[PDB]
Design a protein around this ligand. Structure first.
Ligand SMILES: Nc1ncnc2c1ncn2[C@H]1C[C@H](O)[C@@H](COP(=O)(O)OP(=O)(O)OP(=O)(O)O)O1
Ligand SMILES: [Cl-]
Ligand SMILES: [Cl-]
Ligand SMILES: [Mg+2]
Ligand SMILES: [Zn+2]
Length: 1126
DNA sequence: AACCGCGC
DNA sequence: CTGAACGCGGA
C-alpha cells in the first residue's frame, strides 16, 4: 500500500540520478570463487564510494511489494560515475526469559506476525549483563527478518502491546492455580531501532571514502587504493534584497546575485532587474593559494538567474555542494523564489527539504560549512561568522559590507556589491576544500554514515556509531537506549536533579607575571629533599617510560643527574629567594580518556554486587554524587498529589475533540511536571527554599576482566588523535628549529600548524564525548558511576600536582588537569640525555618529576587481559597512561581579580609568547559572542600594554594611561566621538536562543529589546530563534530596573516621526523633543560597567601585588580600602 | 542569597 | 534528536 508509493519516489530518484550521471550498474554474473586476493581477475567495476542512501527496489519468492536495500554512489577511475545497489533483509531480535521454551515463543510469533514476517531463526550473541558470559556462555535470541522496513515497523506495532500488557497488568483468573502461555516468555525486543542504512553499512562493512570493486558477490574493498578520488565540488552564496532594518523575506524579496565556485573556477550570476550594470569578468584572489577568476552571467531577471543556476548545476554534475548556513538561508530562499516563478527545484536539480527542514539530494552531498564550524572548529561562538572563520582558518581578511548597504549598492555601486558577493563564494569554497572536506570524508572511512549525516550528527552520536561497530564485530548484543527515571527520591525527598562532582578548578593568584620581573619565592626545603630522594628513579622513568629507552644506552645519565642535584641543593640552602620566574603550563595529555583506559573504565564493567561470580578481580573506585532535592517530605509529596487530583488540565494532543482531562489521565511524565511546580511553591513557604544540595561519597566496583570493547574503542580513537597532536607539535618545532630565519615562504609551516591544530582539536571533542556519552540521554551504555569515577580520580590527580608545585614555586590558576604556575629561574628545567647512537632524548624536569609521582600513585596494578581466548586464560598487569606535558616558558601571564574580598576569578587570563604575540586569551568578554562592545574594545587595547615598563609599577602605569583614555570617553559623554562610532561602541548584542514567545514570565535586556523590535518593526522580526538583540540602556524612566530600559539601537535609524513616537513610549516622556542618542544614554550605567572591568583587570590586582591604585578615578571597594590600614 | 540564560 | 564548572549581570 505505502510500499507502492515509496517505489514511486525511488523511481523518481533513479531518474534524477541518471540525469546527473549515476546509472545503476549491475556487475556481470560470475560463478567462480568470491575471493578477495585476485581482485583484478573478477568481473565488476572499481569505484571510490562517495555517498549512500536507503531505498526500495522491486523484484524487477515474495509478492507485489518492494525490497529494502541501499544505493551506493561511486566515482570511477576514468572520470565517470555510477551507482550500484545492495539488498539486505532488515531484522531485529526477541529475547526470552525462559530458554527451555524458546521453541514455544518461536511458534507463537511465526503465527502472530504471519502478515509481516519474512523468516526467523535462533541465534546467539554475547550479553555483557549475563552471568558467565566470560566463560563463553551466550544469550539465545530469536532473529526476525523482514522484506523491508515497513514490514519491520508492523512487527514492532504488533509486539509493543504484548510487552506493555506483560509489564502492566496482572491477569488473575483461578486464584487457586497459579502451564504458562507464550506471550509472557517474551521479555523484550533488541536492536529494533538501528537505522537501516547504518545496519547495512555495519553488517556489510562498507564505508564512504574507501574504494571497492563491485561484483556479483558484493563489494570488495581495495586495500591497495587509499587516496581519495576527486569529486566535482561546487560552493555557492546568494545575495538578496531586503527592506531597511528588517530581515530578507522570500515572499517578496528577490535574489540579486549568486556567486559560486566549481573546482576552483568562479561564476557570478547577476539579476539585471536589480543590478544596475552588466558586471564584467574579474579576479579576486586573496592569496596565491586561493585563485578566484570569476566569469559573469548577466541575466535579465530573477527567473533567468535561477534557470541559469540550475542549468549550470546540471551541466557539471557536482557531487558536493557546499554553503555557509545554506540550510537555513540560501537554500530555502532559492526554493521559495523557484516556486513563486513556477519552477520545480526538485525536477530541476534533485534537491528538496527533508524531514528536518534541511536541503538534501540523492546524488550530491550538501556540506554546510556552518555545521562543521559549530561542531568541529573549536572556535568560540563570537568567532563563528564567515568573516571571523575566514581570518582564523584561511589567514586573510575578506571583503566586508554592511547588510543595510547591499540593496542600495545594487543600484549605486554594483561593482562593490559583486566583489563582496564573490568574496563569500571564495571563502566558502576554500574553507570547504581545506577544512571540511578532508575531515568529513576521512571520518566517513570509519563511521558508518554518509557525508551529509557525518557532518551533522552530534559528537555523542558519532561515538555511539563507533561503539556499535565494535560491539557488532565482537558479536555483542547491543543494549537498548536508556531512559531516565521520571522521578527519583533520596531520604524520602523528591530529587529535582542528580549529578556528580566534576572537574576541579582553583584561582590562587591574581596579578601581572613577567619573565623580566622578579617574584618572591618561599621554597619548602622538605619538598626539595623528597625530589632529591626520588631523583634516581624519576630520571630512569623519564628514559624508560616517557622516552621508551634504556638507561643502558644513555651516555650522560650521571652528568644530567649531578646538574639537577646541584640546582636543587642550591634551592634547599637558599630557599627564600627573589628572582625572575619561569611561567609554565602543565596539562595532562587527553586526561579523561587516559584515566578511563588506565582504570579500564567502561559502563559494562561497573558491577553492583552482580555478577562476575565473584567480583581478586574487583577494582573499587570512588565518586562523589550530588543531589538537589525539595525540602518537602513524602507525606507532603502525597498531599500535593491529591490536591492536583481535584484539578482540571488541558488536553495537549491537538488531534482530539476532548480538551479537559483529569490528573489521572495525564501521562506519568506530565503528572510529575505539575507535581514539581507545586512542590517548588510549597517548599519556599514552609522551609524556605527550592533545592537542598548534598554531596555523598560513593564507591563502585570496576571489574578488571570484562569484555573490553568500549575502552578499546576509546584507546584506538585516542591514538588516532595523538598522531595529529604529534604532527601539530613537530611542525611548531621546525618553524623555530632553523626554519624561522627570515626570509622564507614558511608560511607553509604556519599553514601546517593551523591545519594539524584544527585536526587534533576536531578529534579532541569526539574523543571526550566517549566520556560524556555515558551520561547522554538515550545512551546505549549509560553509567553515572563511570563518569563520576573519572572526574574524582582526575580531581585527586590534579590536587596532588598542585600540592607539589606550591612547595617549589607558585601556582597561579588550575583547571581540571592543568596548572599555570611560576617557578624560580634557578629551578632545574630542560636537558637532553645522549644515546650511544648519538641521538638525544628530551627531558623537562618539572614535568617528569610530576609524572614519576603520578605513576607511583595512580597506576592500576589490577588490569587484566585475555592472553589466550580459546582457554580463557587471563594475564594481570600494571597500566598507566596518564602524563603531564609542558608548554612554555612564557613572557607573561595576567590574571584578574574579583570585586569581592579574598575571591579570585577562574577561567580568565591572558598569556603572551616571548616574541610579544598573544598566546592565549581565555574567557573574557572580548572573546564571547555578544557582550558590551565598549568592554571588548577596552580589553582589546589593554592586555598587550602589560608588556610595557621596566618595573611592576611602570607596567601598571602604562596600562593606567589606557584606562584613563577610555574613562575620558565616558566622562566626556562621548562627545569626542563620531555618531556612528558612538552607537557601535555603546551597543550590547545578545542572542536569544529561542523565540520571544517561549520566554514568557521572564525578564532580561534581550527579551525587552526583542519585544520592542517587534512593536516597532513588525512581528516578522521575532518569529525565528537566534535573534541578535542590539540595544542601549536609557537613563529614563528614572527608577525603572535595567531590563525596562533596553532600547533597540535600530530605532536610531528610523524616520524621525517613528523614532519620536517610540523613544517617548520607551522613556515615558510624552513631551520629549531631543532625540540624540547622547541624551538618551545612561552614562552612569556605562561608567559603572567600565569601572568594574578596570577593577578586576587593573586596580585590584595592582593592590594585591602591593601597588597603589594606578587608576585613581576608579575607587577601590571599601573592604579593600579597609584592608590597607596598619 | 539563591536562581537563571548564555557562552575544562 | 557528550559531560560539569564557572563569570556576569540580571525572596
Ligand atoms: N568537550 C568536552 N566534553 C567532555 N569533557 C571535556 C571536554 N573538554 C574537556 N573535557 C574534560 C575531559 C578532558 O580530558 C579534561 C581536560 O581538558 P583538556 O586538558 O582541555 O583536554 P584533554 O586533556 O582531553 O586534551 P589535551 O591532550 O589537549 O590536554 O576536561
Ligand atoms: Cl566554547
Ligand atoms: Cl555553547
Ligand atoms: Mg589535558
Ligand atoms: Zn570481575
Amino acid at each position: 500500500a505505502l510500499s507502492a508509493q515509496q517505489l514511486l519516489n525511488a523511481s523518481k530518484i533513479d531518474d534524477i540520478d541518471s540525469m546527473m550521471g549515476f546509472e545503476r550498474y549491475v556487475p556481470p554474473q560470475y560463478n567462480g570463487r568470491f575471493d578477495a586476493k585476485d581482485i583484478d581477475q573478477i568481473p565488476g567495476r572499481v569505484g571510490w564510494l562517495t555517498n549512500m542512501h536507503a531505498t526500495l527496489v522491486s523484484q524487477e519468492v515474495t509478492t507485489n511489494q518492494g525490497i529494502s536495500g541501499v544505493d551506493f554512489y561511486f566515482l570511477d577511475e576514468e572520470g565517470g560515475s555510477f551507482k550500484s545497489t545492495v539488498v539486505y533483509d532488515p531484522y531485529f531480535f526477541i529475547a526470552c526469559n525462559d530458554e527451555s521454551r524458546v521453541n514455544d515463543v518461536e511458534e507463537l510469533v511465526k503465527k502472530y506476525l504471519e502478515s509481516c514476517l519474512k523468516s526467523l531463526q535462533i541465534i546467539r550473541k554475547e550479553d555483557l549483563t549475563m552471568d558467565n558470559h566470560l566463560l563463553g556462555l551466550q544469550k539465545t535470541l530469536i532473529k526476525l527478518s523482514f522484506v523491508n522496513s515497513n514490514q519491520l515497523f508492523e512487527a514492532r506495532k504488533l509486539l509493543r502491546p504484548i510487552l506493555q500488557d506483560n509489564a502492566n497488568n496482572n491477569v488473575q483468573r483461578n486464584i487457586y492455580n497459579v502451564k504458562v502461555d507464550a506471550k509472557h516468555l517474551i521479555e523484550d525486543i533488541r536492536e529494533y531501532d538501528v537505522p537501516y542504512h547504518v545496519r547495512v553499512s555495519i553488517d556489510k562493512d562498507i564505508r564512504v571514502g574507501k574504494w571497492y570493486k563491485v561484483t556479483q558477490q558484493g563489494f570488495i574493498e581495495d586495500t591497495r587504493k587509499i587516496a581519495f578520488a576527486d569529486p566535482v565540488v561546487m560552493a555557492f552564496a546568494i545575495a538578496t534584497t531586503k527592506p531597511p532594518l528588517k530581515f530578507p523575506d522570500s515572499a517578496v524579496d528577490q535574489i540579486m546575485m549568486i556567486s559560486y565556485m566549481i573546482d576552483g573556477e568562479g561564476f557570478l550570476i547577476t539579476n539585471r532587474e536589480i543590478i544596475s550594470e552588466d558586471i564584467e569578468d574579474f579576479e579576486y584572489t586573496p592569496k596565491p593559494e586561493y585563485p578566484g577568476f570569476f566569469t559573469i552571467f548577466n541575466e535579465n531577471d530573477e527567473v533567468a538567474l535561477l534557470q541559469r543556476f540550475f542549468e549550470h548545476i546540471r551541466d557539471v554534475r557536482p557531487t558536493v555542494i557546499s554553503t555557509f548556513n545554506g540550510d537555513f538561508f540560501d537554500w530555502p530562499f532559492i526554493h521559495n523564489r523557484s516556486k513563486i516563478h513556477g519552477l520545480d527545484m526538485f525536477d530541476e536539480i534533485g534537491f528538496a527539504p527533508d524531514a528536518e527542514g534541511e536541503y538534501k539530494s540523492s546524488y550530491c552531498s550538501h556540506m554546510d560549512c556552518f555545521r562543521w564550524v559549530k561542531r568541529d572548529s573549536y572556535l568560540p561562538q563570537g568567532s563563528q561568522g564567515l568573516k571571523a572563520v575566514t581570518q582564523s582558518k584561511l589567514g586573510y581578511n575578506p571583503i566586508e559590507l554592511d547588510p543595510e548597504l547591499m540593496t542600495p549598492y545594487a543600484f549605486e555601486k554594483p561593482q562593490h556589491l559583486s566583489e563582496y558577493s564573490v568574496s563569500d563564494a571564495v571563502a566558502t569554497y576554500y574553507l570547504y576544500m581545506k577544512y571540511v572536506h578532508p575531515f568529513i570524508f576521512s571520518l566517513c572511512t570509519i563511521i558508518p554514515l554518509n557525508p551529509d549525516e557525518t557532518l551533522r550528527k552530534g559528537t555523542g552520536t558519532l561515538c555511539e556509531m563507533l561503539l556499535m561497530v565494535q560491539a557488532y564485530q565482537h558479536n555483542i548484543l547491543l543494549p537498548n537506549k536508556h531512559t531516565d527515571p521520571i522521578e527519583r527520591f533520596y531520604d524520602g525527598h523528591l530529587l529535582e536533579s542528580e549529578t556528580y562532582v566534576g572537574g576541579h578548578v582553583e584561582s590562587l593568584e591574581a596579578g601581572v607575571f613577567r619573565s623580566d620581573l622578579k617574584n618572591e619565592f618561599k621554597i619548602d626545603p622538605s619538598a626539595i629533599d623528597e625530589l632529591l630522594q626520588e631523583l634516581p628513579e624519576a630520571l630512569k622513568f623519564s628514559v624508560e617510560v616517557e622516552n621508551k629507552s634504556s638507561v643502558d644506552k644513555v651516555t650522560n645519565f650521571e652528568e644530567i643527574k649531578n646538574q639537577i642535584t646541584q640546582k636543587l641543593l642550591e634551592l634547599k640552602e637558599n630557599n627564600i629567594r627573589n628572582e625572575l620566574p619561569l611561567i609554565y603550563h602543565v596539562d595532562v595529555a587527553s586526561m579523561y580518556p587516559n584515566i578511563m583506559t588506565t582504570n579500564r573504565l567502561q559502563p559494562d564493567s561497573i558491577k553492583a554486587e552482580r555478577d562476575c561470580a565473584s567480583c581478586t578481580c574487583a577494582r573499587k573506585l570512588k565518586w562523589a554524587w550530588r543531589g538537589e532535592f525539595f525540602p518537602s517530605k513524602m507525606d507532603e509529596y502525597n498531599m500535593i498529589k491529591r490536591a492536583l487530583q481535584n484539578e482540571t488540565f488541558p488536553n495537549k494532543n491537538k488531534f482530539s475533540k476532548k480538551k479537559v482531562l483529569t490528573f489521572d489521565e495525564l501521562s506519568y511524565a506530565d503528572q510529575v511536571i505539575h507535581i514539581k511546580k507545586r512542590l517548588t511553591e510549597y517548599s519556599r513557604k514552609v522551609y524556605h527554599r527550592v533545592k537542598v544540595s548534598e554531596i555523598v561519597e560513593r564507591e563502585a566496583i570496576v571489574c578488571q576482566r570484562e569484555n573490553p570493547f568500549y575502552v578499546d574503542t576509546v584507546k584506538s580513537f585516542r591514538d588516532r588523535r595523538y598522531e595529529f597532536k604529534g604532527l601539530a607539535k613537530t611542525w611548531k618545532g621546525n618553524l623555530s628549529k632553523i626554519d624561522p630565519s627570515d626570509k622564507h615562504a614558511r608560511d607553509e609551516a604556519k599553514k601546517m600548524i593551523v591545519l594539524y591544530d584544527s585536526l587534533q582539536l576536531a578529534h579532541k571533542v569526539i574523543l571526550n564525548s566517549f566520556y560524556g556519552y555515558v551520561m547522554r540521554k538515550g545512551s546505549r551504555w549509560y553509567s553515572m558511576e563511570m563518569a563520576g569515577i573519572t572526574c574524582l580520580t582526575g580531581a585527586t590527580i590534579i590536587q596532588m600536582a598542585r600540592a607539589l608545585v606550591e612547595r617549589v614555586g607558585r601556582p597561579l590558576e588550575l583547571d581540571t588537569d592543568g596548572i599555570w604556575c611560576i617557578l624560580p629561574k634557578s629551578f632545574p628545567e630542560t636537558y637532553f640525555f645522549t644515546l650511544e647512537n648519538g641521538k638525544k632524548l628530551y627531558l623537562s624536569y618539572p614535568c617528569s618529576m610530576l609524572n614519576y609521582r603520578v605513576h607511583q600513585k595512580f597506576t592500576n596494578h589490577q588490569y587484566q587481559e585475555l592472553k589466550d581466548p580459546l582457554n580463557y586464560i587471563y594475564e594481570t598487569h600494571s597500566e598507566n597512561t596518564i602524563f603531564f606535558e609542558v608548554d612554555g616558558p612564557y613572557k607573561a601571564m595576567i590574571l584578574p581579580s574579583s570585586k569581592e574580598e579574598g575571591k579570585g576569578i577562574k577561567k580568565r587570563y591572558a598569556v603572551f609568547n616571548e616574541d610579544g604575540s598573544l598566546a592565549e586569551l581565555k574567557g573574557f568578554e572580548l572573546k564571547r559572542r555578544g557582550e558590551l562592545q565598549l568592554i571588548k574594545n577596552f580589553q582589546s587595547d589593554i592586555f598587550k600594554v602589560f608588556l610595557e615598563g621596566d618595573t611592576l609599577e611602570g607596567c601598571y602605569s602604562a596600562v593606567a594611561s589606557v584606562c584613563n583614555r577610555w574613562l575620558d570617553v565616558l566622562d566626556s559623554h562621548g562627545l569626542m566621538l563620531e555618531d556612528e562610532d558612538l552607537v557601535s561602541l555603546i551597543c550590547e548584542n545578545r542572542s536569544m536562543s529561542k523565540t520571544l514567545k517561549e520566554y514568557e514570565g521572564q525578564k532580561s535586556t534581550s527579551i525587552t529589546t526583542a519585544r520592542r523590535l517587534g512593536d516597532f518593526l513588525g512581528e516578522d522580526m521575532v518569529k525565528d530563534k537566534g535573534l541578535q538583540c542590539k540595544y542601549i540602556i536609557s537613563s529614563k524612566p528614572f527608577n525603572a530596573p535595567v531590563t525596562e530600559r533596553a532600547i533597540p539601537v535600530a530605532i536610531f535609524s528610523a524616520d524621525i516621526p517613528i523614532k519620536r513616537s517610540f523613544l517617548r513610549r520607551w522613556t515615558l516622556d510624552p513631551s520629549l523633543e531631543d532625540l540624540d542618542i547622547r541624551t538618551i544614554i545612561d552614562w552612569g550605567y556605562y561608567r559603572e560597567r567600565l569601572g568594574s572591568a578596570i577593577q578586576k583587570i587593573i586596580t585590584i590586582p595592582a593592590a594585591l601585588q602591593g601597588v597603589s591604585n594606578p587608576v585613581p578615578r576608579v575607587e577601590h571597594p571599601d573592604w579593600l580600602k579597609r584592608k590597607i590600614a596598619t
